Design an enzyme around this catalytic site. Structure first.
Site, mmCIF file in Angstrom:
data_model
loop_
_atom_site.group_PDB
_atom_site.id
_atom_site.type_symbol
_atom_site.label_atom_id
_atom_site.label_comp_id
_atom_site.label_asym_id
_atom_site.label_seq_id
_atom_site.Cartn_x
_atom_site.Cartn_y
_atom_site.Cartn_z
ATOM 1 N N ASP A 1 -27.151 -12.123 86.724
ATOM 2 C CA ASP A 1 -28.015 -10.989 87.041
ATOM 3 C C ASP A 1 -28.699 -10.431 85.804
ATOM 4 O O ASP A 1 -29.896 -10.125 85.833
ATOM 5 C CB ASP A 1 -27.197 -9.915 87.746
ATOM 6 C CG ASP A 1 -26.610 -10.428 89.036
ATOM 7 O OD1 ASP A 1 -27.243 -11.350 89.601
ATOM 8 O OD2 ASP A 1 -25.538 -9.943 89.479
ATOM 9 N N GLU B 1 -22.737 -9.003 85.745
ATOM 10 C CA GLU B 1 -22.927 -9.016 87.186
ATOM 11 C C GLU B 1 -23.411 -7.635 87.628
ATOM 12 O O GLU B 1 -22.929 -6.610 87.131
ATOM 13 C CB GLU B 1 -21.622 -9.388 87.899
ATOM 14 C CG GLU B 1 -21.724 -9.402 89.407
ATOM 15 C CD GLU B 1 -22.068 -10.762 89.970
ATOM 16 O OE1 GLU B 1 -22.964 -11.436 89.408
ATOM 17 O OE2 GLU B 1 -21.427 -11.137 90.980
ATOM 18 N N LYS C 1 -23.722 -5.218 91.008
ATOM 19 C CA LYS C 1 -23.218 -5.035 92.357
ATOM 20 C C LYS C 1 -23.298 -3.547 92.656
ATOM 21 O O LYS C 1 -23.096 -2.723 91.764
ATOM 22 C CB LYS C 1 -21.781 -5.565 92.494
ATOM 23 C CG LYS C 1 -21.659 -7.080 92.422
ATOM 24 C CD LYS C 1 -22.267 -7.776 93.618
ATOM 25 C CE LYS C 1 -21.854 -9.232 93.636
ATOM 26 N NZ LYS C 1 -22.539 -10.037 94.692
#
Lengths: 230, 230, 230, 230, 230, 230
Positions: free
Chosen positions: C64, C95, C97
């Site tokens: 990401d 990451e 999220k």
């Protein structure tokens, strides 16, 4: 005689130099010097009017021209339209005044003193020892020199190296530049028609000998946001 | 087979490479090589047609492609629309010629020789010793190779390292590239369909092994403006 | 109280910070983090969504946010509109999220692990020894923290340093940031209203301690184009 | 309520707007207004501190903020670091003053008058007739309004359209904006929390109704260099 | 006497002008003229060495300086490193030659003739009629004038307007410039020390009077890719 | 055969075109089309993924590719990292889908319908009448065409011009492009190996015939900030 290294050096950034001479003749300022420096200086450096700040929430007064590391600076602040630069990022600080005289010399020494009095941090590196602090260059930038006697200016510029107000370099555009030599361990004044470009080359030389930016202690600034546990 | 590292490498800067192949086919030049280098090289480097000058007021002849340090260069001269670069800033110098033959090899060696004959300065650093002088890469960039026999080109490219005209690297676009290995202590020729990209990677590898720009003696250029007292 | 270092620090890149808080409130993402990092980070660094590749033709999964060295990178690949970055260039991998929970912690650890498992090269320098490999920073960037109990998050974040999935830093925007301390040899969580800026300063501090890019073995990528003779 | 057109309008160029409010609170300026305008205005327009000059060698006084046509301007002058703009290029001229009071209203009217008194040229076009001269927008930009009674400000702002000092628009940041309406044929004052953005939209509307730059008579400037024969 | 409109006009783009005078003195070229034009011209225009092409697959010879519409051009071709411009985009075409003499006049007229002989399209607009074709300006740019007698140059420059080789404008740097007047319906020569800046203002005036780019018939180029059914 | 206008047209922006073919072959998308358009389109236009909004606080759904006027647009909004464009600024709207089939045709018609249903304002100009509203181009951009029979696609694309969902243009990369002709008053499908560049030239042609942006009613947006008195 065009392809003479002498000619190339004089022609280097001729336009910004010409802007400075016009100002000198209109007096017979500040923005020209900033422009001048940003053209001559290598990419690592940037010049700007600015305040300097340290991680102890101390601020200098507004500095007419600050030369700082733009490339390896971790942060620069903008309050309103003002630039505020961490002291650790500063290579040189200049006062700008129309005339070079005892009073503006003293005024420059006080501005330089106020920046050098700030607290600068420096960490160790992977484990080497923390780097010595850069020696911040202090100077004075003027349009007309009012101390025509090289003795009458030599005198008011003899300051001790321990003194935090000491001026390392300075210029009266298209007239003279002074600087401090270590070999000679004295001040040196040079009166020359091309003193602006010679002053700039001297500046480049002192910058090159400054030393590398030390590692900023980022947590010494970050402590203004969150506590730390020992 | 698209997400094959091999394919990514071939597709890298595909457009400028395609420009070079068309030129090769139109011959069956100079600006393409400059464009090619400026796309492949990291930010520190710049490529340009230029003259090289030293602090002794000596000039090379016009060099078809010079690769120099744009990031840490203290000055670059602009005469008319010509670029004049201080020798201390130079990493590599190339002759461009349509065909790779004994005569253009010799023409390349003479251009390279003229740049390496210039005087380059190097100061000590805080007090370390002055840095060794960079080994300037010399090469020859061509469109078509006229020495089809790898023995007939090997022969005219065996030059001694102590010779100032020696060619470290060269290319015949989409056909072959040569280079000097130190481990092997000889020249090596490689005939390959993708010789342009392989030549570039070889160039990147030699540039990486060059060494850091020495500290330029700025006063050795500044002496063209003002005297110094010992 | 405007000219308080505390206020300058909060006001720094205020606009991109504000974009992040709105997203946090709209959830009550990915592009905001990339934007945020590219504003806070010094010029040497760039952040981008990307794949990472090594010279053994191994690829990570899409990451990401990759923070890589744009200044000293010798090449970066572009498949279609995808960025593919050599592992040797990578400083940190994140990451993204929406929520900070055990599952997204594990998801981050697996992405980080996949990058650190790649093969990175490092050459000697003129002859010094080859530089130690940078320690790649792994983190997790979220909008809302779902582990409100500092014990219930502390537990699922205690990992071993020898584990390639270990997370060095992470943030739940405008709520909390965590990080690993070596002095303390543990993880540390901080719940603070200004956690986004404090997280960023922590990131700058870890980047500063990473080490300089090792010298990439360019021939280990160039071998995909031509053979070499031992 | 985030995706409300109202909210999008308020959030537009939020950062430069925030800079203006801080200045307003620090007074409880000039550069902020220039910054603000250059962010809100379409590419055709540029804002800058500057002098205005006409082809009759007449100069205005320094104008705190000039909005001029940068796209279709055939020339703009630079004395030293000063901008000097041909009158034919000028869309709007503003005085900047900390406070909105009768005296600064009069000061604005005199600056605006000095620009509108300049001579502007306008040629015919292929053969159509020469375009009507743009109506130059005059205003006053302040931080704090000192005429709190809408009657006590309305009165000192009622001027006649035939007067060259008349003010078309003005703002006391985050407090009020005024403007002249032709339909209403009067001045109109609006006291609103979001007066800065509403003022800007009013400015965009007046600019849109100005008309396109007339064709400058380039020879009326070129006559300063060479004679012409009738 | 610095703030004299006359002085501002002479100081305008002083640097590029100085480059041109040096070249003139080094002769006692091409790239300087391109640079000069790109500094003086408004954003709509760009100058470049280039070939001109039409939708009938006809090409001019290489034109030392083409001035074309960069802002409203639908396409410009790049072959190798060569620029190829569609004829519909062309405002002016110049031959560059060291000396102004009968032969370079004739050489200029032949280059101009070859561009004006190309086929240019022009569509109607919503339904107005198709716009008249722009009158392409043709000129000759030189460093030294070899026809010192104004009768000896007047003679070799009297050409009919219906001739496609006719020269509308030209310059001998810092010496003289000529141009065609319609009112006077003749050529006019001006010998002046500041002839370069006066020539540029004359060019700006002719460009202004050219007319707007006609609407290109894009399908007349697109027919090279796909058939059309009537 | 290189300097063939046909060849220049195919080589125009070859790199971005090549990116699109790779995607087509990896399917055997969105960002490539945006990139493609921004390379082919003249400076006045910009392409982006975006929502469209009108002054009645109505929003379209996210539009894969919007082509809008960047040059003369008075404002564009940014929520988080999303672009929101005033309807008055929109020239064309496209749906992107991997395959060209009846369902994605219908999906495109619904996205186009939702933009054209928005309310667009248009003022009069000094006093001329208000300009007719631009006819917004609607299309569909795909990688593989699943309606191989030109009858089986002709049928599902016959829509009435009064219908707000009607598709004016569309492409299956490197395979076919369709468009609506007014002379013919029908749809037209073209199957050609170079259909991507032919589609682009068709797009340029329809854009050129759209009409000039009408004058936006800025007060129709400004009314969201302040009331008006009739």
């Amino acid at each position: 005689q065009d392809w003479q290294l002498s000619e190339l050096l004089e022609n280097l950034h001729a336009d910004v130099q010409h802007k400075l001479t016009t100002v000198r003749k209109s007096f017979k300022a500040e923005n020209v010097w900033v422009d001048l420096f940003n053209q001559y200086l290598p990419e690592r450096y940037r010049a700007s009017r600015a305040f300097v700040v340290d991680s102890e929430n101390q601020f200098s007064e507004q500095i007419d021209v600050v030369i700082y590391d733009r490339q390896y600076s971790p942060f620069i602040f903008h309050y309103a339209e003002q630039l505020i630069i961490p002291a650790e990022s500063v290579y040189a600080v200049f006062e700008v005044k129309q005339t070079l005289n005892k009073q503006h010399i003293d005024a420059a020494r006080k501005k330089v003193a106020s920046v050098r009095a700030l607290h600068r941090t420096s960490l160790p590196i992977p484990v080497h020892s923390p780097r010595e602090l850069i020696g911040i260059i202090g100077g004075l930038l003027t349009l007309e020199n009012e101390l025509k006697i090289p003795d009458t200016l030599m005198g008011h510029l003899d300051h001790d190296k321990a003194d935090k107000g000491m001026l390392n370099i300075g210029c009266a555009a298209d007239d003279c530049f002074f600087y401090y030599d270590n070999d000679h361990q004295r001040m040196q004044v040079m009166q020359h028609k091309k003193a602006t470009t010679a002053f700039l080359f001297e500046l480049l030389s002192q910058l090159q000998k400054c030393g590398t930016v030390p590692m900023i202690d980022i947590h010494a600034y970050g402590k203004w946001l969150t506590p730390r546990i020992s």
